[PDB]
Amino acid sequence: HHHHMPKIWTERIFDDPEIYVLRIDDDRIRYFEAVWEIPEGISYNAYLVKLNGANVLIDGWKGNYAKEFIDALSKIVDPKEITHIIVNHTEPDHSGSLPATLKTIGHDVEIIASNFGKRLLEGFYGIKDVTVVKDGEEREIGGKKFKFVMTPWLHWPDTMVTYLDGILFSCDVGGGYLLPEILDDSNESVVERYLPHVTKYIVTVIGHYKNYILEGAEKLSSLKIKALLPGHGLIWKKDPQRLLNHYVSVAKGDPKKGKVTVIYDSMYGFVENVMKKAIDSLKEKGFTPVVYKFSDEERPAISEILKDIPDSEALIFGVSTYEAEIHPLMRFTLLEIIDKANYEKPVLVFGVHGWAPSAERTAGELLKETKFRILSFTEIKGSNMDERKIEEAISLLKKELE
Amino acid sequence: HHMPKIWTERIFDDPEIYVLRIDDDRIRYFEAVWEIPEGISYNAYLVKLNGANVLIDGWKGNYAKEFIDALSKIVDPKEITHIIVNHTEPDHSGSLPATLKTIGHDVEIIASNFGKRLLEGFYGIKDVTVVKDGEEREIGGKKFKFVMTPWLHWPDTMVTYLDGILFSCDVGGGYLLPEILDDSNESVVERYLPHVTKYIVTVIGHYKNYILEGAEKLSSLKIKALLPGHGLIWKKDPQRLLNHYVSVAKGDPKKGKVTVIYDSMYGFVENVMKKAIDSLKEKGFTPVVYKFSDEERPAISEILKDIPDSEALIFGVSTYEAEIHPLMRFTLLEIIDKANYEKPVLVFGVHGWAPSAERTAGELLKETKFRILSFTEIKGSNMDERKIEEAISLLKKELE
Ligand SMILES: [Cl-]
Ligand SMILES: [Cl-]
Ligand SMILES: [Cl-]
């Protein structure tokens, strides 16, 4: 499958403070967290800060790349001269190289983490001597002031960001999928192509906690932010506020005019027939549908469905009945939308009237517990159906959005 | 240019019976869910009698033109007098509207009571003769007997008995595009039956108790051949197929077989499972292993196929947010829905910091027939690897 080793970037990105990035481009991974389809890949970004009397490592790489990490680090510093390691987030996509790193340094170093971070490092790796920093705590290290800001539930309770002279090292906060062709936000075209992969990352990794994005953005707003250096994806040296505003806009679900996401299963073609008419009606009325169909020949990626929800003006679901409940892939999709992408947006539901036991929960009653506002339910029938009901539903949606 | 393969062949001389089989190699997901890279066939039958020609079932609607073309090579469709619809699901009935149009005059359509309702619902077909359980009809000088076998897997399902020959539609079906039409080669049969298990669990598993009821019901008939709507025709040894259906429905286990199902996000679950699997092997078990990882994602249909004849299951689970890993949730829910068997299970789990409200793997299994012998904690440091051995040894003792 893979013809080459993962691409590694090692570059000085600031002169004062002297900061290096160590980035590896993981094109081996297929499913982030063993669930989210990312054919585009993801990078892991670690940093080294070379100071006067200290060398500070910030974060690390996934453990399957530990050997590559130590080789890359050794090119920019003798690992024996490392004095501090800052662990903003202990998840193994960032901390997996830490045991090998500690072994290669060969002497004690100060490891800095949050309170929960300390507990997790002990749990994962048996690392015991960890210095805990509290919210807003400052430490003078190598002649410079580091400040630690807790940003819990982005997306674990251990998560924090490290601030140095206007430079924020933010680990998952500000991350995205995709392996960008450059390191930073200097080129407009690269940024525009990258941002939808940031949306996909936010919803899939942080969506359940999208309220804590808003709390975190507010907390970070009080800091002077000159640059944002995340643990995945692009570095933002020019316009970090653009990334923060994007995060907030995704978390708030700010809609793109005209965008309607249509998600359905069609076991035999009856749902398809109705959805095709609904989609054509939407197009006639000036909307731009984004369509995800589960059929006997096609299966969308759940990560891609999730990506499209936040900026949708509305959603339309087309549902088959199956046994006592609904179609299994539709169940999975709805449960993940509820978990990751629970937004106050209008919805239409189209469904086959089956013969499921009345005890079975409908797609409709599952959706009724969410923030979504179901405008109407429309029955999908084989023969004898009133196609005027499809147009009525789409017209109702148009009037709602007007 | 590749076209799905069509078989049209005379398979009995008296009565004169033809199969019309199409080998669907376009379909990827049966019922839009079950992964079937092996494909599935649609088998319809024509019985040519003295004064009648009886079509039994049909093909999926995307192959309606092909169906009419193939049918027209063995009979003038205008000479069809009767159509028997054992089951109205569109994989069998989709060609019916085109068939009716091509015949061009009224025919007697025969179905169960619920079948009749479904034909009207799907297609607007109103002229349907409802046959009752055990009803016999004389058509073309021969006696057809109709037997209701409901919930295999819809309430409309029946089978048609003709002189020892059972047209069974989904009952007795399998996935796979077999290399020959019938059960006349052992190697073909052996390779086929696991795809029959896959089919039973995925399509009929929720209603597996009705397999046992249906088999008991049919036991009063002398069956010389079984002609289903998918897969192989059984002319030599239909008993072998029926026994297979029953043993899957009962979950009769293969001694030594344990199915191990887990997710591993960062290698901690993998490390524990590798040790559990090695321990199983050292004690003489033959594990079947399904791992959800950041590079690999098994098909749920393949996991399901392996349940019924496992002596036991082992799950390795990560906690995730308030609940468990999302693919393990999906997997567990499908096992509970399709493969609810009275089998022992071991659970190995990571201890999360999930909200206590969220349901565990244990809560999901509580109302099922599965019994959890033990739960063991997966830890990343200072974990007691003795605990794994103890669990596997507990399971072996339980299975004696
Ligand atoms: Cl459908
Ligand atoms: Cl893990
Ligand atoms: Cl699910």
Short mmCIF file of C-alpha atoms in Angstrom, two decimals, chain A residues 38-365:
data_model
loop_
_atom_site.label_atom_id
_atom_site.label_comp_id
_atom_site.label_asym_id
_atom_site.label_seq_id
_atom_site.Cartn_x
_atom_site.Cartn_y
_atom_site.Cartn_z
CA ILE A 38 -9.84 10.24 7.22
CA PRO A 39 -8.47 9.31 3.85
CA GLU A 40 -6.78 12.78 3.94
CA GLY A 41 -4.68 11.81 7.00
CA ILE A 42 -3.64 13.80 10.04
CA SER A 43 -0.38 15.27 11.24
CA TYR A 44 1.14 15.12 14.77
CA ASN A 45 3.00 18.33 15.69
CA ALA A 46 5.47 18.63 18.57
CA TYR A 47 7.63 21.60 19.38
CA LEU A 48 11.03 22.36 20.86
CA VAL A 49 11.80 25.62 22.55
CA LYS A 50 15.53 26.34 22.89
CA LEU A 51 16.09 28.84 25.67
CA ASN A 52 18.89 30.29 27.76
CA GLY A 53 19.59 27.44 30.24
CA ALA A 54 16.60 25.27 29.22
CA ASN A 55 15.36 23.18 26.32
CA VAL A 56 11.61 22.59 26.49
CA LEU A 57 9.86 19.85 24.57
CA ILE A 58 6.15 20.43 23.99
CA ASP A 59 4.03 17.36 23.24
CA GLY A 60 5.17 14.41 21.11
CA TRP A 61 4.10 11.92 18.46
CA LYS A 62 1.95 8.76 18.34
CA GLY A 63 3.77 5.77 19.75
CA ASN A 64 4.07 3.86 16.50
CA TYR A 65 6.35 6.70 15.39
CA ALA A 66 8.50 6.86 18.59
CA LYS A 67 11.69 5.87 16.83
CA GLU A 68 11.15 8.43 14.06
CA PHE A 69 10.46 11.08 16.72
CA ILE A 70 13.70 10.48 18.60
CA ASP A 71 15.68 10.50 15.34
CA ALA A 72 14.07 13.78 14.26
CA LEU A 73 14.51 15.41 17.70
CA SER A 74 18.20 14.40 17.79
CA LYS A 75 18.75 16.44 14.62
CA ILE A 76 17.86 19.67 16.38
CA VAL A 77 19.08 19.02 19.90
CA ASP A 78 21.13 16.56 21.89
CA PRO A 79 18.31 14.90 23.82
CA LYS A 80 20.56 14.86 26.94
CA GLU A 81 20.18 18.68 26.97
CA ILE A 82 16.42 18.52 27.35
CA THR A 83 15.35 19.93 30.74
CA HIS A 84 11.54 20.17 30.57
CA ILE A 85 8.67 18.44 28.82
CA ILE A 86 5.23 20.08 28.67
CA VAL A 87 2.32 17.75 28.13
CA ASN A 88 -0.74 19.83 27.24
CA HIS A 89 -2.90 16.74 26.61
CA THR A 90 -2.00 13.16 27.46
CA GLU A 91 -3.82 11.26 24.74
CA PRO A 92 -1.45 8.82 23.05
CA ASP A 93 -1.54 10.53 19.63
CA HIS A 94 0.60 13.20 21.41
CA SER A 95 2.15 11.29 24.32
CA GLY A 96 2.96 7.91 22.83
CA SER A 97 6.62 8.84 22.16
CA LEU A 98 7.12 10.01 25.76
CA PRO A 99 8.49 6.78 27.25
CA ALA A 100 11.10 6.46 24.50
CA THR A 101 11.90 10.12 24.86
CA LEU A 102 12.47 9.83 28.60
CA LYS A 103 14.71 6.84 28.04
CA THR A 104 16.77 8.65 25.39
CA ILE A 105 17.24 11.78 27.53
CA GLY A 106 18.66 9.45 30.17
CA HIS A 107 18.19 11.69 33.22
CA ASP A 108 15.29 13.20 35.11
CA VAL A 109 13.53 16.13 33.51
CA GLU A 110 10.64 18.24 34.76
CA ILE A 111 7.40 17.07 33.25
CA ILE A 112 4.62 19.63 33.37
CA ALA A 113 0.93 18.71 33.06
CA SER A 114 -2.49 19.47 34.45
CA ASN A 115 -3.80 17.73 37.52
CA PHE A 116 -5.75 15.19 35.46
CA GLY A 117 -2.83 15.01 33.02
CA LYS A 118 -0.59 13.81 35.84
CA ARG A 119 -3.06 11.06 36.76
CA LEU A 120 -3.31 9.89 33.15
CA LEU A 121 0.46 9.82 32.64
CA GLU A 122 0.72 7.54 35.68
CA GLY A 123 -2.12 5.41 34.33
CA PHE A 124 -0.84 5.08 30.78
CA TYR A 125 2.92 4.91 31.32
CA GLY A 126 3.72 4.69 35.05
CA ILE A 127 5.35 8.16 34.93
CA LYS A 128 5.29 9.36 38.52
CA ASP A 129 7.22 12.57 38.99
CA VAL A 130 5.08 15.14 37.26
CA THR A 131 4.72 18.78 38.19
CA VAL A 132 1.10 19.91 38.19
CA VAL A 133 0.33 23.42 37.02
CA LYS A 134 -2.88 25.16 37.94
CA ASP A 135 -5.05 27.46 35.87
CA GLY A 136 -3.28 30.68 35.03
CA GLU A 137 -0.03 29.58 36.73
CA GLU A 138 3.19 31.23 35.44
CA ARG A 139 6.64 29.61 35.48
CA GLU A 140 9.96 31.27 34.62
CA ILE A 141 11.86 28.73 32.53
CA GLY A 142 15.03 29.56 30.63
CA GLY A 143 14.55 33.30 31.18
CA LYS A 144 11.02 33.38 29.79
CA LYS A 145 7.56 33.36 31.32
CA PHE A 146 5.35 30.41 30.43
CA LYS A 147 1.67 30.64 31.42
CA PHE A 148 -0.67 27.63 31.61
CA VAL A 149 -4.37 27.97 30.89
CA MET A 150 -6.78 25.13 31.56
CA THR A 151 -9.26 24.49 28.71
CA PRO A 152 -11.00 21.39 29.99
CA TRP A 153 -13.09 19.07 27.85
CA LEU A 154 -11.30 19.97 24.60
CA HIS A 155 -11.78 17.08 24.48
CA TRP A 156 -10.54 15.49 27.76
CA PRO A 157 -10.53 16.84 31.29
CA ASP A 158 -6.68 17.09 31.18
CA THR A 159 -6.49 19.61 28.38
CA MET A 160 -4.62 22.90 28.72
CA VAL A 161 -2.78 25.38 26.55
CA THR A 162 0.69 26.79 27.08
CA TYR A 163 1.35 30.46 26.42
CA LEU A 164 4.85 31.82 25.77
CA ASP A 165 5.32 35.49 24.66
CA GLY A 166 2.09 35.56 22.64
CA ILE A 167 2.70 32.09 21.19
CA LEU A 168 0.03 29.51 22.16
CA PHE A 169 0.84 25.80 22.10
CA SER A 170 -2.64 24.38 22.05
CA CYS A 171 -2.44 20.69 21.17
CA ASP A 172 -5.94 19.53 20.03
CA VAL A 173 -7.42 23.02 20.33
CA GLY A 174 -7.01 24.50 16.85
CA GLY A 175 -6.24 21.14 15.20
CA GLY A 176 -7.55 19.81 11.91
CA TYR A 177 -7.34 16.78 9.65
CA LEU A 178 -5.47 16.95 6.28
CA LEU A 179 -1.71 16.99 5.53
CA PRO A 180 -1.22 20.55 4.31
CA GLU A 181 1.37 21.22 1.61
CA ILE A 182 3.01 23.85 3.81
CA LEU A 183 3.52 24.38 7.60
CA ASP A 184 1.55 27.54 8.18
CA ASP A 185 -1.34 29.91 7.26
CA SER A 186 0.68 32.07 4.92
CA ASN A 187 -1.11 31.04 1.66
CA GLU A 188 -4.80 31.85 1.22
CA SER A 189 -5.55 28.96 -1.09
CA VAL A 190 -4.14 26.37 1.31
CA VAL A 191 -6.15 27.90 4.17
CA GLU A 192 -9.44 27.84 2.24
CA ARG A 193 -8.92 24.15 1.33
CA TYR A 194 -7.90 23.26 4.87
CA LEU A 195 -10.80 24.80 6.80
CA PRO A 196 -13.46 22.17 5.86
CA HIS A 197 -11.05 19.56 7.32
CA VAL A 198 -10.90 21.64 10.48
CA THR A 199 -14.73 21.50 10.59
CA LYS A 200 -14.60 17.71 10.21
CA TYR A 201 -12.04 17.47 13.05
CA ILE A 202 -14.09 19.73 15.34
CA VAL A 203 -17.32 17.78 14.91
CA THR A 204 -15.83 14.31 15.11
CA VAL A 205 -13.27 14.89 17.92
CA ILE A 206 -14.73 17.75 19.93
CA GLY A 207 -18.42 17.90 18.90
CA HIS A 208 -19.90 16.37 21.98
CA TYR A 209 -18.20 19.17 23.93
CA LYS A 210 -18.89 21.97 21.47
CA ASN A 211 -20.13 24.17 24.41
CA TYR A 212 -16.62 23.98 25.91
CA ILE A 213 -15.25 25.42 22.60
CA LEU A 214 -17.22 28.55 23.23
CA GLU A 215 -16.03 28.67 26.92
CA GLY A 216 -12.43 28.04 25.84
CA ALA A 217 -12.40 30.66 23.08
CA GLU A 218 -13.61 33.22 25.64
CA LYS A 219 -10.90 32.28 28.07
CA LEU A 220 -8.15 32.42 25.45
CA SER A 221 -9.47 35.83 24.18
CA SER A 222 -8.07 37.55 27.24
CA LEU A 223 -4.47 36.53 26.21
CA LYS A 224 -2.48 38.43 23.60
CA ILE A 225 -2.33 35.80 20.82
CA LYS A 226 0.30 36.33 18.17
CA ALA A 227 0.39 32.69 16.96
CA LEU A 228 -1.37 29.44 17.49
CA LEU A 229 0.67 26.23 17.29
CA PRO A 230 -1.61 23.18 17.45
CA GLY A 231 -0.91 19.45 17.84
CA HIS A 232 -2.47 18.58 14.44
CA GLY A 233 -2.55 20.33 11.08
CA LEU A 234 -1.60 23.87 10.14
CA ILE A 235 0.25 26.38 12.31
CA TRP A 236 -1.31 29.88 12.43
CA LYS A 237 1.33 32.60 12.60
CA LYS A 238 -0.42 35.25 10.51
CA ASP A 239 -4.08 35.14 11.57
CA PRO A 240 -4.82 32.91 14.57
CA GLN A 241 -8.04 34.76 15.19
CA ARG A 242 -9.37 33.43 11.89
CA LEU A 243 -8.95 29.88 13.25
CA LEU A 244 -10.55 30.77 16.57
CA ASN A 245 -13.51 32.44 14.81
CA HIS A 246 -13.90 29.28 12.67
CA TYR A 247 -13.98 27.13 15.80
CA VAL A 248 -16.69 29.35 17.29
CA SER A 249 -18.69 29.44 14.08
CA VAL A 250 -18.68 25.59 13.85
CA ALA A 251 -19.58 25.29 17.58
CA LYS A 252 -22.46 27.75 17.11
CA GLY A 253 -23.65 26.14 13.88
CA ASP A 254 -23.63 29.34 11.78
CA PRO A 255 -25.34 28.32 8.53
CA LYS A 256 -24.27 28.65 4.94
CA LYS A 257 -27.19 30.15 2.90
CA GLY A 258 -28.89 27.57 0.75
CA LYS A 259 -27.17 24.51 2.29
CA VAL A 260 -29.47 21.60 3.07
CA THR A 261 -28.01 18.18 4.05
CA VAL A 262 -30.13 15.22 2.99
CA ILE A 263 -29.44 11.86 4.67
CA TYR A 264 -31.33 8.70 3.80
CA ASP A 265 -31.40 4.96 3.46
CA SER A 266 -33.07 3.23 0.58
CA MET A 267 -33.37 -0.53 0.93
CA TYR A 268 -35.36 -1.12 -2.25
CA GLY A 269 -35.74 2.21 -4.14
CA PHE A 270 -38.96 3.58 -2.64
CA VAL A 271 -37.15 6.02 -0.36
CA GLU A 272 -34.81 6.93 -3.23
CA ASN A 273 -37.74 7.78 -5.47
CA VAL A 274 -39.19 10.20 -2.96
CA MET A 275 -35.80 11.70 -2.03
CA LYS A 276 -34.99 12.34 -5.69
CA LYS A 277 -38.14 14.42 -5.95
CA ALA A 278 -37.39 16.23 -2.70
CA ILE A 279 -33.86 17.03 -3.91
CA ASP A 280 -35.13 18.28 -7.29
CA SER A 281 -37.70 20.47 -5.48
CA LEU A 282 -34.93 21.93 -3.29
CA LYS A 283 -32.86 22.67 -6.38
CA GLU A 284 -35.81 24.34 -8.14
CA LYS A 285 -36.17 26.60 -5.12
CA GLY A 286 -32.53 27.72 -5.11
CA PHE A 287 -31.10 25.44 -2.44
CA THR A 288 -27.88 23.50 -2.82
CA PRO A 289 -28.36 20.03 -1.36
CA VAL A 290 -25.57 17.91 -0.03
CA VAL A 291 -26.72 14.30 -0.25
CA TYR A 292 -25.74 11.21 1.69
CA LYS A 293 -27.42 7.94 0.66
CA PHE A 294 -27.09 4.48 2.23
CA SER A 295 -28.07 2.00 -0.55
CA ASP A 296 -27.32 -1.53 -1.60
CA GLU A 297 -24.35 -0.14 -3.59
CA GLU A 298 -23.16 2.97 -1.65
CA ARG A 299 -22.28 3.75 1.94
CA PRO A 300 -21.17 7.21 2.98
CA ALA A 301 -18.52 7.94 5.64
CA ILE A 302 -20.02 9.06 8.91
CA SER A 303 -17.23 11.59 9.34
CA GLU A 304 -18.31 13.29 6.11
CA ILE A 305 -21.95 13.46 7.12
CA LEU A 306 -20.95 14.98 10.46
CA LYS A 307 -18.72 17.57 8.78
CA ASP A 308 -21.69 18.98 6.85
CA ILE A 309 -24.14 19.46 9.67
CA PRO A 310 -22.89 22.61 11.43
CA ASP A 311 -23.23 24.94 8.43
CA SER A 312 -26.43 23.40 7.05
CA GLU A 313 -29.49 25.58 7.18
CA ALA A 314 -31.57 22.43 7.55
CA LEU A 315 -31.46 18.63 7.43
CA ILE A 316 -33.77 16.17 5.67
CA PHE A 317 -33.91 12.53 6.72
CA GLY A 318 -35.41 9.69 4.71
CA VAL A 319 -35.95 6.58 6.78
CA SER A 320 -36.80 2.87 6.19
CA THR A 321 -38.55 0.84 8.91
CA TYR A 322 -36.67 -2.33 9.82
CA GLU A 323 -37.85 -5.09 12.23
CA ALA A 324 -39.06 -3.27 15.36
CA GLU A 325 -37.01 -0.09 14.75
CA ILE A 326 -35.24 1.61 11.83
CA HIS A 327 -32.41 0.75 9.46
CA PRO A 328 -29.12 -0.03 11.46
CA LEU A 329 -26.94 2.42 9.55
CA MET A 330 -29.57 5.12 10.02
CA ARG A 331 -29.58 4.32 13.77
CA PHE A 332 -25.80 4.70 13.91
CA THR A 333 -25.93 7.95 11.94
CA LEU A 334 -28.64 9.47 14.12
CA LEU A 335 -26.92 8.48 17.34
CA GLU A 336 -23.63 10.08 16.14
CA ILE A 337 -25.45 13.26 15.01
CA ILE A 338 -27.07 13.43 18.41
CA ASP A 339 -23.75 12.90 20.14
CA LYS A 340 -21.52 15.20 18.02
CA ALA A 341 -23.78 17.59 16.11
CA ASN A 342 -26.82 18.49 18.23
CA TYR A 343 -27.88 21.87 16.78
CA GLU A 344 -31.10 23.90 16.87
CA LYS A 345 -31.90 23.60 13.16
CA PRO A 346 -35.09 22.78 11.28
CA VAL A 347 -35.53 19.25 9.98
CA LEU A 348 -37.93 17.40 7.69
CA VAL A 349 -38.51 13.70 8.16
CA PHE A 350 -39.77 11.37 5.43
CA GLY A 351 -40.42 7.80 6.48
CA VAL A 352 -41.91 4.55 5.32
CA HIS A 353 -44.94 3.41 7.38
CA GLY A 354 -43.88 -0.08 8.43
CA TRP A 355 -45.28 -2.80 10.67
CA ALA A 356 -42.66 -2.56 13.43
CA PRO A 357 -43.84 -3.35 17.00
CA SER A 358 -45.27 -0.15 18.56
CA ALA A 359 -42.67 -0.51 21.38
CA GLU A 360 -39.97 0.39 18.83
CA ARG A 361 -38.73 3.95 19.00
CA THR A 362 -39.03 5.88 15.75
CA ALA A 363 -36.35 8.02 14.11
CA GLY A 364 -38.81 10.83 14.90
CA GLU A 365 -38.96 10.22 18.64
#
